[PDB]
Design a protein around this ligand. Structure first.
Ligand SMILES: C[S@@+](CC[C@H](N)C(=O)[O-])C[C@H]1O[C@@H](n2cnc3c(N)ncnc32)[C@H](O)[C@@H]1O
Ligand SMILES: C[S@@+](CC[C@H](N)C(=O)[O-])C[C@H]1O[C@@H](n2cnc3c(N)ncnc32)[C@H](O)[C@@H]1O
Lengths: 318, 329
């Protein structure tokens, strides 16, 4: 029935919490060495004997854990994506949802009634690990979705620790890259930079993009940037991208974009409510919204293109 | 789409909260008289313009609202089951999840680490000042959602060999009343704490069962159980620690005549403890809500029944996530 599906959505916070706590405990990382029986897994996770077995079996029943002859083990998906240290690890997103977003979303009604965020308005490394997991599939797709051989240089605006840019340059040996972010991010960028071995091919530029021009490059990337800010400041960033680009250069913007008709992309619409809860004036937008802003900024051509999972990009040519 | 399935589960708290808040706002009730535009619905709910349309459009994208030419409307399910005032209203489940259970599950980690329930700081009588209309709506929904299993309990057993039935911890008596309506030969007794009698009496009066049904005030951990040919335990044993569950089975055996039956129903976990998500989640609910409760399997229960001296037990599916275990003295 339609009502059974409706109630399953309504009570989805229970199974969500089961998986979020398992991620917070690093349960899947503890199983990366091999299968463990319930008593051993409980001891490693420091869980109480009352409900540990129920907890593990719930994960099995949800399809996010294997159990064979009394030993729990990762599924192919949890092995690939929820084991810490692996390149495709996105568990940082679940750890952040468990530590912060679950309780923040508990304040949705107040956000809806006031229109004001419901948050405070390590730590940095927690935010960066959540962002890496959010942008993980999109960063790989970004390296394949555009013919990068046509550009010499790329500047990632709001680059954080530089994961997207580093993968782009590793994937395309000809590229030179510049990451742009606040000065407090430089150490995290410098660490990833040194670990990549990319050397002189990659550089960091410290600054505030609401007070300083952007680095000049053949391509400029905006990953999960514009959705954080009220529309006039996003329009300011699009103008600065135009000024930083040469003729034929491109601006690339990717988000969990809402469908143009605003009736299908659930992660995008949910993201817009996260922006409500987290920011004074951010919101999630549609590809059509962005193409209007880009034409207004002076770009001559633009298209919307699917990326990965719920995320999409808008590309414009100066 | 394997990782996409996992991410849908892990972030299900968001879609949940959207629906839970829509229920606490009575959004679907506001749409009962007919479709409303965004600004009209916004104003009727006293929501800020910044995110009202995003909220409304999320519900459309989840498939719980319709939108035609900019007019938001109930889907057939929300119009039937999420409009306050209707006898079929189930929104009390969402209201109570929003008001209470969502935050409770926020403490799952502490419950798993401590083994202790997670459910003083406020003033005197704080607990007594909860929204009684929301509490009533929640109970109305649990009464309704249980009707399938009450229908099944009446049909799964040949009740003709038994004269009398007692429901132990009967609460408002819904199952016992339905069984008596379906099998008019049965005389019935509901057994529960004295404070439960008003809610039972209301259902008793509404049923017309009259002289064929009685309520008996009692504490089943402190007094003998009513003697009847059949004893029913609906969602009782799972609320209590194992020594107490065994104690109740012993008292059932003592209360029953030779040939009498004990009838237990629960959201049982599958015997292999790997399939039944409602049952496993219920066991974690018991962690968070009770000091000693636990969900169990049919096989677990048949062992306790054999140890209590019962004969000829079996496990039988009832309806949806509910199953019964029945045994003969
Ligand atoms: C949501 S994170 C996005 C990280 C990355 N682009 C991605 O998609 O995963 C936003 C980034 O913008 C940066 N940022 C915020 N305000 C900034 C400012 N005023 N100037 C430069 N960078 C800023 C933050 O440091 C943060 O790393
Ligand atoms: C799960 S609720 C009842 C559910 C009911 N059997 C049904 O399925 O609709 C547990 C019931 O046991 C009753 N109860 C709890 N402790 C009791 C006690 N010590 N003696 C008698 N009844 C008790 C409560 O009042 C409550 O009605």
């Amino acid at each position: 029935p339609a009502i059974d599906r409706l109630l399953q959505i309504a009570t989805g916070f229970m199974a969500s919490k089961v998986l979020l706590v398992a991620a917070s405990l690093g349960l899947f990382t503890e199983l990366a060495a091999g299968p463990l029986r319930g008593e051993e897994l409980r001891a490693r996770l420091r869980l109480h004997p009352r409900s540990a077995r129920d907890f593990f079996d719930t994960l099995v029943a949800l399809g996010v854990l294997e159990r064979t002859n009394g030993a729990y083990a990762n599924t192919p998906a949890t092995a690939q994506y929820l084991v810490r240290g692996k390149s495709a690890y996105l568990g940082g997103l679940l750890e952040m949802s468990d530590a912060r977003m679950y309780e923040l979303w508990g304040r949705l009604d107040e956000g809806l009634r006031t229109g004001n965020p419901q948050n405070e308005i390590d730590r940095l490394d927690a935010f960066q690990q959540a962002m890496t997991g959010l942008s993980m599939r999109s960063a790989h797709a970004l390296a394949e979705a555009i013919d990068w051989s046509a550009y010499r240089t790329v500047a990632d605006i709001g680059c954080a620790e530089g994961t997207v840019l580093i993968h782009l340059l590793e994937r395309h040996p000809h590229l030179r890259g510049t990451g742009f972010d606040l000065a407090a991010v430089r150490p995290s960028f410098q660490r990833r930079h040194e670990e990549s071995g990319l050397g002189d091919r990659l550089a960091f530029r410290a600054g505030d993009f609401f007070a300083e021009p952007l680095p000049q490059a053949d391509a400029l990337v905006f990953g999960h940037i514009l959705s954080n800010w009220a529309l006039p400041k996003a329009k300011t960033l699009l103008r600065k991208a135009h000024e930083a680009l040469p003729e034929g250069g491109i601006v690339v913007i990717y988000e969990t974009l809402i469908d143009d008709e605003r009736r299908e992309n659930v992660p995008g619409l949910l993201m817009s409510l996260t922006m409500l809860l987290e920011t004074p004036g951010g919101f999630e937008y549609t590809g059509a919204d962005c193409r209007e802003w880009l034409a207004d900024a002076g770009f001559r051509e633009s298209r919307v293109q699917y990326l990965a999972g719920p995320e999409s990009m808008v590309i414009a040519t100066k």
